[PDB]
Amino acid sequence: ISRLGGPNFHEIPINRPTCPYHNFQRDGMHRMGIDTNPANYEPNSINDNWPRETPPGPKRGGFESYQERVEGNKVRERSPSFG
Amino acid sequence: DSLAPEDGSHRPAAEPTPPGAQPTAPGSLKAPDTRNEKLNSLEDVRKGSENYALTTNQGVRIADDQNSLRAGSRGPTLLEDFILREKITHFDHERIPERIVHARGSAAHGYFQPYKSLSDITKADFLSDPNKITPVFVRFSTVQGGAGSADTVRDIRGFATKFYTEEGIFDLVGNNTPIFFIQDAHKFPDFVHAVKPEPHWAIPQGQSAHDTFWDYVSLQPETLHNVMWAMSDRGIPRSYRTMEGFGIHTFRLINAEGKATFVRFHWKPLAGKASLVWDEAQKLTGRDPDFHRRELWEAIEAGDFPEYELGFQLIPEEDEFKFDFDLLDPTKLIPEELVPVQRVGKMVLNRNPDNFFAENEQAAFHPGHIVPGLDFTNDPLLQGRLFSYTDTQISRLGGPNFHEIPINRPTCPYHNFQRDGMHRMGIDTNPANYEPNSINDNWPRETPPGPKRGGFESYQERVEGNKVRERSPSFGEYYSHPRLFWLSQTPFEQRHIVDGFSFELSKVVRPYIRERVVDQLAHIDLTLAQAVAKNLGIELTDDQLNITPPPDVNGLKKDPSLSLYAIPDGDVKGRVVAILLNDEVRSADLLAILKALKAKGVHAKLLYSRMGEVTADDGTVLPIAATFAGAPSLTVDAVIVPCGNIADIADNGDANYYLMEAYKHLKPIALAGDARKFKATIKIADQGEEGIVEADSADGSFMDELLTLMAAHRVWSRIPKIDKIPA
Amino acid sequence: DSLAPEDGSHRPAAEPTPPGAQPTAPGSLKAPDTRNEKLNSLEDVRKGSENYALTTNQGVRIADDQNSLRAGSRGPTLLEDFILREKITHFDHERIPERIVHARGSAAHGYFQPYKSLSDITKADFLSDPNKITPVFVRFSTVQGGAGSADTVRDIRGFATKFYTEEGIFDLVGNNTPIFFIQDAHKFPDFVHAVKPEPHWAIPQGQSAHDTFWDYVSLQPETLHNVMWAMSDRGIPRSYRTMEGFGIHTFRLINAEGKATFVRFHWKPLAGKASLVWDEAQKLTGRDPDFHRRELWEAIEAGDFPEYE
Amino acid sequence: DSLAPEDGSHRPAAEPTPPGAQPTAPGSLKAPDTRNEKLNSLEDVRKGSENYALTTNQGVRIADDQNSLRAGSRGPTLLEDFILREKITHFDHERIPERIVHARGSAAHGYFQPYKSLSDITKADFLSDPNKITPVFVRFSTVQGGAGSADTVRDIRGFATKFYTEEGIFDLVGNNTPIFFIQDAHKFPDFVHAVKPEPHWAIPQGQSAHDTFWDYVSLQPETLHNVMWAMSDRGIPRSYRTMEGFGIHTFRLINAEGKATFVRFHWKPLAGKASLVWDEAQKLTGRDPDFHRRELWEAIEAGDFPEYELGFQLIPEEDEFKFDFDLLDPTKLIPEELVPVQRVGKMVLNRNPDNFFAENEQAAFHPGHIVPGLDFTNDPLLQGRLFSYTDTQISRLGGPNFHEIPINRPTCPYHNFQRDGMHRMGIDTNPANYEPNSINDNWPRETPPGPKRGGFESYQERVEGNKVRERSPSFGEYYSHPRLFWLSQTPFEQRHIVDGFSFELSKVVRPYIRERVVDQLAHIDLTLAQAVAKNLGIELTDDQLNITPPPDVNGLKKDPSLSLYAIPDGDVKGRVVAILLNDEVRSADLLAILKALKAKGVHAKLLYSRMGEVTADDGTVLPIAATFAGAPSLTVDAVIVPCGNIADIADNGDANYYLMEAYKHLKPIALAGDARKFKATIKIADQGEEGIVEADSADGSFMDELLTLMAAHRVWSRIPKIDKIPA
Ligand code: HEM
Ligand code: HEM
Numbered sequence A: 001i002s003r004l005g006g007p008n009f010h011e012i013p014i015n016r017p018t019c020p021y022h023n024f025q026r027d028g029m030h031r032m033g034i035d036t037n038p039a040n041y042e043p044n045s046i047n048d049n050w051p052r053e054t055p056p057g058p059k060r061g062g063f064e065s066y067q068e069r070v071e072g073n074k075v076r077e078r079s080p081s082f083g
Numbered sequence B, D: 001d002s003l004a005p006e007d008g009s010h011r012p013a014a015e016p017t018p019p020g021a022q023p024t025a026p027g028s029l030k031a032p033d034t035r036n037e038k039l040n041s042l043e044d045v046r047k048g049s050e051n052y053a054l055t056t057n058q059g060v061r062i063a064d065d066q067n068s069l070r071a072g073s074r075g076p077t078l079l080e081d082f083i084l085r086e087k088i089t090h091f092d093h094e095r096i097p098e099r100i101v102h103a104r105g106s107a108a109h110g111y112f113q114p115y116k117s118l119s120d121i122t123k124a125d126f127l128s129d130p131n132k133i134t135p136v137f138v139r140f141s142t143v144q145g146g147a148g149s150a151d152t153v154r155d156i157r158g159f160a161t162k163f164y165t166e167e168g169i170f171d172l173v174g175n176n177t178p179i180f181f182i183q184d185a186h187k188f189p190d191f192v193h194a195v196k197p198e199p200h201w202a203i204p205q206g207q208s209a210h211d212t213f214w215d216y217v218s219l220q221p222e223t224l225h226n227v228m229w230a231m232s233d234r235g236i237p238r239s240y241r242t243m244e245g246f247g248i249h250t251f252r253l254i255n256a257e258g259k260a261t262f263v264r265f266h267w268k269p270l271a272g273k274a275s276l277v278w279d280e281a282q283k284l285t286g287r288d289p290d291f292h293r294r295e296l297w298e299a300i301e302a303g304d305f306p307e308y309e310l311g312f313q314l315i316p317e318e319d320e321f322k323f324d325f326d327l328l329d330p331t332k333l334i335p336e337e338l339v340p341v342q343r344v345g346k347m348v349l350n351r352n353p354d355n356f357f358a359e360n361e362q363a364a365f366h367p368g369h370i371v372p373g374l375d376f377t378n379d380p381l382l383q384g385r386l387f388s389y390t391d392t393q394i395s396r397l398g399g400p401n402f403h404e405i406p407i408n409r410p411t412c413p414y415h416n417f418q419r420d421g422m423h424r425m426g427i428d429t430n431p432a433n434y435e436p437n438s439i440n441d442n443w444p445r446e447t448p449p450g451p452k453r454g455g456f457e458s459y460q461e462r463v464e465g466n467k468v469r470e471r472s473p474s475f476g477e478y479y480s481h482p483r484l485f486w487l488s489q490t491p492f493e494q495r496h497i498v499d500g501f502s503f504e505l506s507k508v509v510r511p512y513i514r515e516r517v518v519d520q521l522a523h524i525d526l527t528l529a530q531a532v533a534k535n536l537g538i539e540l541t542d543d544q545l546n547i548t549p550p551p552d553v554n555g556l557k558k559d560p561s562l563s564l565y566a567i568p569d570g571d572v573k574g575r576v577v578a579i580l581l582n583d584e585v586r587s588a589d590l591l592a593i594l595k596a597l598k599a600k601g602v603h604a605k606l607l608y609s610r611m612g613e614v615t616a617d618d619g620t621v622l623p624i625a626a627t628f629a630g631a632p633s634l635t636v637d638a639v640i641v642p643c644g645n646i647a648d649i650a651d652n653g654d655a656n657y658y659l660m661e662a663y664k665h666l667k668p669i670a671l672a673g674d675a676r677k678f679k680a681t682i683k684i685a686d687q688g689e690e691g692i693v694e695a696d697s698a699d700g701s702f703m704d705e706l707l708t709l710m711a712a713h714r715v716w717s718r719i720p721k722i723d724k725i726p727a
Numbered sequence C: 001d002s003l004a005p006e007d008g009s010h011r012p013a014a015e016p017t018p019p020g021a022q023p024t025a026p027g028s029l030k031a032p033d034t035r036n037e038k039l040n041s042l043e044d045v046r047k048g049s050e051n052y053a054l055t056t057n058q059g060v061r062i063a064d065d066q067n068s069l070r071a072g073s074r075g076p077t078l079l080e081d082f083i084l085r086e087k088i089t090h091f092d093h094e095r096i097p098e099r100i101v102h103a104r105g106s107a108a109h110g111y112f113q114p115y116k117s118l119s120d121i122t123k124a125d126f127l128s129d130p131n132k133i134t135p136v137f138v139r140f141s142t143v144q145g146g147a148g149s150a151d152t153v154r155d156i157r158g159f160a161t162k163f164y165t166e167e168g169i170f171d172l173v174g175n176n177t178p179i180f181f182i183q184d185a186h187k188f189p190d191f192v193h194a195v196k197p198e199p200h201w202a203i204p205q206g207q208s209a210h211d212t213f214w215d216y217v218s219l220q221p222e223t224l225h226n227v228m229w230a231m232s233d234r235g236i237p238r239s240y241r242t243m244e245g246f247g248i249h250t251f252r253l254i255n256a257e258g259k260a261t262f263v264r265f266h267w268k269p270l271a272g273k274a275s276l277v278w279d280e281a282q283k284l285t286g287r288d289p290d291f292h293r294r295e296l297w298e299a300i301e302a303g304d305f306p307e308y309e
């Protein structure tokens, strides 16, 4: 946000995905993409909910985190195993 | 030189004056002696003017401030005019980014003071001694429109308080309704995008009456409780002084023994609750877009300071699952009938800023600004907010040193090993800028947690579960709390909700969206559903007619705390009355009227068709404050027309409409003597009617009937009559 | 999925419709075939939507866009939710500084074309051949209020035209009255400070009816010609289509032999001149603050294109 | 706690200590009592540390500053750790943009004081009374490399002085050579692009020895005078204390009667002029890249304050066309033989900063920062500069309020009607922010021009001509001033110029560019041309051999003021000597040596092969300052090897090379008693030679021969010998 001037650093040409990216993020300094989508929020009926969420799968699916188990208290404390 | 008028009239009196009696001023100049610890510490950055030479920012005095440096008086401007280029460069760069939400906003200075020590429940120093008063800075705001938008729009208002405490800044950032629209912070961008101006053409401003707003509401039934509030009269307040404030999340109070209590924060308006009606509120954004900014500035200059009670809803940790709604759900309110608001202290706003940009526009408020004695909960909307308000300052306020901007500075010490960043004001003399260190013997040092003046330590809540992006099933209920709100409304309050939905929905261009919103209403209450449906030409399906209503909230059928008008409370003090003058006004009437008003604390505006002054029948000179068209009925609370030469204003379209608008907006109208001629205008029975005070002369009882109606705010009984009036 | 109504009613017809007959749309979607050289070159940065997966800015598709990553469904949000933090960071930084003057404003695309060659008076290529049409972008504006202010206020309106010519951009930045308030640019900050909201309390918005404005007018008699214009019906127009435009300075036209001609530029409204009356204009900023933005968008969608000479 | 060593050794003595005797400190802590008016006014933003609790920027004390908030000690970090996110956000945003040129740079605090009143020539208050001392802030800099580049590179150095005067800030922004490379400011971007790292790969750093530099020189003959200076020893100074400074443009002094005088500004180094030699200077950027930053900080801590004389070259307006070079040409110098430098006052630098970023990195200097009594001329490079240094601050320093950053603030009043902009510190209480105004009775007011405390008014010079982008024909001569410079050099000075060009040019990959630069040299002087050509394997064309030399400069054939060494002046004070110890050093030698040095003000470094301490033959304990490899000969001025157990260091490769490097770099070497064994290393005749002081014991005369050689800086007579040495 300060080095590269703002939330659109991914539009600076070296940093751009060579694959598609579409979502409902709008505006911010030196915004290069002109969005033609009538909606900039989901859920929406007016552009029939596009772009849509994808379920997780073997190939080309959405990102889902690994469901690791967490148990403990809220502590600012170093694990004894690091000692 | 001259330019100033001698007779001194360019400067306001440094003492309380009524609304519009003087030009308004900077705080310091109007109230030199209202001080407090934050106000006194800003003294190091206040700049004066008088008897000072005009200079560049580098201290060089300017001889000609009217002309550019040109080669001959009709020739070209030279690049070496450094005086011109500095003056136009600072102009070129005046504007910073506005708040991405809540950009509109109005602020004032004042203090907080506790009623008693709350040491038994929290180890928070600002609440530890009734004798400890705390400097606050408060900014009231709207939510949708930009900083140039109008004040009396239909919207949620924000209410943010900065507490300059001895152990850190505590910001309590809340709004004026007790639940929010969204459960999870991940959806905040989609909701704000849907309320906001539409992307292709940036319309509308300051309004939710547009398709995308209502599209997202119909597809998201959790937004429905807070949309009910915004659709009520609660969405158009009379003043920032006449509204409640709420922190909306469940937080924790931690005492010195480690015991945690859940709490929800309230602000109770000591002037009563009161709102405008929509035709009034909408027309007034045209007639005066700064009405709420203006009237706050002027209540404080008249000494009608705003006051609020801080109030806690405390719930023991054991009762965490005693209700049939989840306490960590931000779309659920805790009925005061189930849990009472305990009054904890009082806040008084008694000083305006000197510079709006400097003090108000550069103020940063963030909910993560908590002190020892307070802590957070797992509320999913509170957890996300925590990320956001540090982040946003890096562009709004240019960088990581926004706390050095003077309104935002702790009045207590802060020392740590953070260095550099844009417009770094502190010059650090510490030989170390890392800890642990031996070279400055480890200073500044960490402090252990303790009962008073200790370090921040988080409450050790137990966490067990898997890493899941998933909503708790306890959040899954969308309809009993909107129906509890609906059932707690007076009948005319509910009318006004029907009419709020019907207006907004008439402005959706796509009819399937409107139908989709009526279906949702039929899950709340069918009467509500049928009323809105009718105004829209929609028929309910027999299946819609057979939807089973939601359950009660812990067997509660209504709570009257949720209504604005059901249990009455009313400031008549600080309200404003318009008096319609003519050229031979009867002074008998007038001195009686003004004495009565003055005893109650009510402000008058003497209004005519021309500016300047008229002369009462006894030769008294009365200065005119505005014309009838200049200060419409929209801006006062009641109209009084004294007797005198009535023939003068009787034929005047403006004077007559002044009364018809006021009638329709349900305000008290008082007619003395021949002024009763105007009954024929607003169509009243000679026999009289309620809310029209009339008499042979303005006197004691006439004024008593008027101030009594005024304490009741509007004449609700007139609502059947006002439909036939064309105004 | 559904969410869209089938019967198709969520989408507007891609053809001229009257005011309020359809929902309004993006230009490309409402008028797929109005093209010009500037419009076609923006094609490289237009982004579509349909049939596309929702992603992060780095191209990673999102499976759940409704929830944050928490340790248990009633637990705390985790700092490793990079999907949530990207979505809220771009939100946190949406807003750039607004124009320090003329912040309100409404714009449209179109073209310019000369009646004949003006080669005898100027060697300016955009005016050299009646057959050469030039892409323009035009923004109409007010002067005092912020971008969130109302459209039908009493004020001077701006009229700025960007000419995408074969030899460079020519911007003709003018207003709707033919003289300005100030003679020298050194005073511009003092005049704009005096019209603007007052420093202590930031009132009023979109209005000159306040002391400081009229203080500086009474002390500065050169402001009086243009104050007369602003005080006339000329200060409350019916539409951006119903007003004149002016460059206000004397400029020079230089032809190919080196001869210089002084010139003043005008824009003549082919729909006629028309203004509101003040009670109307003032009440309308309450009733519809976007009236001028709205009606320009809709004249162009109905095909009632604005034209000027 | 502990962490600090008790015995107190972590803190430096707050008094002058020699180089490397103590750890260095913040200014305030090392010199609590060097005060001045600018230093005292920064007191409001200095922050201490001791006995203070570690806090957030919002004042909340931190209990654990070692750990993040995680759900269990091996679990994930929680988004609600606001203490962690504030600490890492300020880190993430530490860096501002660096100066687009002159980014390297080192600064100090001090004062200026006039010798007498110059009221007869200028109405400038800082020069009006010999009793008026003025706070200055000075930053010395290089030109090409980034802020992370090395100090002893071959380049032009900058010399910028901020004068905090009673009537405004006067910035005198100059460099260390008297002419610039370019005539017109329009070409500044092309020249800086050509010197700078090349665009494709960003090489080289801190060097002009690359193709594009020399490409633009060969195509632009106006750059040749200042390239001659950069190619001389003038381009590698020994210290910022040992160089001249120059304003380069002709300016105007305006007195109280309106008379204008042209002036050129000089700074004369009261320590003498002295430079490194290139192998030394280049190797030293590897061995200590901070050598110039270090040695300035330490001269000031030892109390060897830098001092300079401000000197004026005054020329009456009538003599504007008396020379055969245009006075407004920035590539032409005015020979001191034609116009003398009159010494006007003195400047002393006597206090270091407390925080480099805050004070040094945020300092803004701009030549348009002039005061009443001074004015500009039509110099085309001065006119363009005027645009630039206001502009650049809007991104470097984030905005139009850089003058509020504490190092940059006027110590005198400044009031005007400029409002808002990013990190606006002043809260303006003025009811007006425009003039003319009646409501604050027109304050702050314009001031008429006058003799003392009046407004700025420009000198009414006559302008006639057409609007033309055209260079004056008077600027058209490119070669007599480089040949005047060349002819005024001692013979070894000229050698060093030949060798500067030959090294740089050997690094151009494209040979046509090198040939093109030799052609240009043949227009200056053929000897110069032939010497460089030879080192490069280039032959001059008989036509090149027949180029007619340029004319004299007003019949001047040489001026010795342009040489560094021709008229000698030499500080031995503040210089540094290395003493090579062994394990049984003869104390007789050592106490004589150190007494002698101390009487002259010279600093010693006792150096060994190991750290810790050795013991003299009488049992004295000597602490070792560095190893031979740790503080190379490169960093001292002379080497003394006392007698004692010589056998110890005699076989040591480091101790022997220490002497060969020093020999080669033309430094004085003194050998006492058995230490004379090392003559065999540096190959000296038993009969002796100049610059090697040798004797049976270190004594009075031995030290006298040494300090005398030292006042003469290098042993130039050795230059024929040093070619056979492999070091
Ligand atoms: C219970 C719900 C919420 C309440 C009561 C609330 C209240 C407020 C208020 C009163 C302000 C105005 C600040 C001012 O006057 O300067 C504000 C600003 C803001 N809010 Fe919220 N908000 C809520 C939810 C959210 C969420 C979920 C986010 C972000 C994920 C958010 C992000 C922000 C930001 C970025 C600003 C502007 C911040 C600033 O200018 O410092 N808010 N909010
Ligand atoms: C004949 C008098 C003037 C006219 C006709 C005029 C017209 C305009 C117009 C139409 C705009 C709006 C730009 C847009 O729509 O984006 C504008 C912007 C602006 N004007 Fe003026 N202006 C005048 C005088 C001045 C003066 C004297 C100054 C400065 C010394 C000035 C400074 C600016 C600046 C800084 C902006 C905002 C610039 C931008 O956003 O690019 N104007 N002016």
Ligand code: HEM
Residues within 6 Å of the ligand: D099, D100, D101, D102, D105, D139, D140, D141, D158, D159, D160, D173, D174, D175, D180, D185, D188, D247, D248, D249, D330, D363, D364, D365, D366, D381, D384, D385, D388, D389, D392, D396
């Ligand atoms: C006689 C020729 C020149 C001299 C003696 C000179 C000297 C200097 C010096 C000493 C600095 C360093 C400032 C510091 O220490 O903070 C500087 C900075 C700079 N100079 Fe020059 N300069 C010359 C020509 C130019 C020209 C022609 C331009 C621009 C058209 C220019 C633009 C700048 C800028 C933009 C900076 C950085 C400014 C800043 O950081 O405030 N200089 N110059």
